[PDB]
Amino acid sequence: APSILSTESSIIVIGAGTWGCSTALHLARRGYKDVTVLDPHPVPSPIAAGNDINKIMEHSELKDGSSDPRSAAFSTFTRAALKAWKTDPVFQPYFHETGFIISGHTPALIDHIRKDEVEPSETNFVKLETAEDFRRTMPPGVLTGDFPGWKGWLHKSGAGWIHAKKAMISAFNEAKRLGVRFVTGSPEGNVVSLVYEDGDVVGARTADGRVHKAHRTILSAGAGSDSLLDFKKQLRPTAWTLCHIQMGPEEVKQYRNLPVLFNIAKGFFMEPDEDKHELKICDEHPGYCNFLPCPNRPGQECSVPFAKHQIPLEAEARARDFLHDTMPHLADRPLSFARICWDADTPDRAFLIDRHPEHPSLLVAVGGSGNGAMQMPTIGGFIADALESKLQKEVKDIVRWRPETAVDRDWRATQNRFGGPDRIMDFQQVGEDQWTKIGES
Ligand SMILES: Cc1cc2nc3c(=O)[nH]c(=O)nc-3n(C[C@H](O)[C@H](O)[C@H](O)COP(=O)(O)OP(=O)(O)OC[C@H]3O[C@@H](n4cnc5c(N)ncnc54)[C@H](O)[C@@H]3O)c2cc1C
């Protein structure tokens, strides 16, 4: 029998990343007086995927939606997220409604975007057919490439980019100010395992040995969640790569209020951040896994997350071939920063927010699956809903606990992503001299 939930209930959130801070904030705002958040790092965490100078936000509605319940759930998440990016003062300053370009460069990719993304959407786009159509979405001198074989779609409003790092900091700040307790650092906040009494989770044991007891334990640790609970293959830690190119104080002025340019098989980039003038590029691919035997001594293989402020040279290559099609004049610029970035993919890349059906006091909130950052303002809300057993019908069944969809899971399934070798890649098959070497020299 799980304890009756009230505002006095001591709550623990494991993980103060994108989803953790969002939850801490929402719990605070609802009247919960006893919320403690645990993280092995101070905000922003160096391993939190939400720690990026920028991420893409997009919201689309559907024609129908009875035709695709997975996607109808996503609109529900994003309709909420967009509204909050525009009205909630904690999040508002860090949304940049600059627009979103989705595109490809081969017949089958372009037809894919037409069929899966554009046709089903109630959104009205501007069809980009030529190299001038791409170049003229941005000020003179920003896009200067030939865009070979490229065809795309511009989405003006209800899409843009977000300063995820700062918004995560802003939410942390407001949660902390409304009275949430943040235990962020090692060993105090580094949770090494959960705590069981009578088949349920009574709290969290951290690396310092203390058992933090709670009536409800919320687990939101991103890629790290896999090594804290048996998720039954429902979470694939996968990594993606990014790198920063620093701009000059003179040239950087032209790269302002730029719409997100995404080619689903080459990558995307976002406008230079206001602080360091750094321009960010991700080479799009199905992702990097780090295949090792699981930490629990099996012959089962797993993707184990590690941290690195470098990227494989093969990713720098893919980034620069992207640069070359779009902004050739920046193609041979030296990188100023790079790192690998860890998320968790579910078998269908819908979120995982549910009470564990064997430990009712545990609430997992994980599996952002590449689309979790934009949800920042409001994800904590649906998480609070789930906790408060009122997760609305439009999403409940889609994001529920579902280990049967991960039976016989192919860890190398491309999960609707394209680019590079068009296969899942493995960090183990990348040499130690085959990474970038940023600084110095
Ligand atoms: C390269 C890249 C680009 C992306 N671009 C976008 C985008 O444009 N738009 C979008 O919506 N999404 C995007 N995503 C997904 C995005 O990163 C989301 O932020 C991700 O889904 C975040 O979910 P999260 O809060 O659960 O994880 P995180 O933000 O990573 O938070 C995890 C936190 O849990 C902590 N933690 C870890 N381990 C332990 C432990 N043992 N005990 C306690 N605590 C712990 C971590 O330190 C961290 O603070 C992108 C992802 C990547 C990798």
Numbering used by the authors: 2 to 442
How does the study describe this entry?
Using a rational in silico computational design and screening method, we have produced two forms of the deglycating enzyme Amadoriase I featuring a significantly higher thermostability compared to the WT enzyme. In particular, the introduction of disulfide bonds provide considerable stability to proteins by locking their fold in a well-defined local or global conformation.
To confirm the formation of the designed disulfide bond in the SS03 and in the SS17 mutants and to assess any possible change that such modifications may have caused to their global molecular architecture relative to the wild-type enzyme, we solved the crystal structures of these two thermostabilized species. The crystal structures of the SS03 and the SS17 mutants were determined at 2.15 and 2.85 Å resolution, respectively. Focusing on the region where the mutations were introduced, the SS03 mutant (S67C/P121C) is highly superimposable to the wild type enzyme (residues 62 to 72 and 116 to 126, RMSD = 0.842) while the SS17 variant (D295C/K303C) shows a structural rearrangement in the region from residue 290 to 308, with an RMSD of 1.657 Å. Interestingly, while the introduction of the disulfide bond in the SS03 mutant does not cause any significant structural rearrangement in any portion of the enzyme, the formation of the disulfide bond in the SS17 mutant affects the conformation of one of the loops that define the boundaries of the tunnel leading to the catalytic pocket (residues 63 to 69) (orange circle). For the SS03 and the SS17 species, the mutations did not significantly affect the apparent steady state parameters relative to the WT.
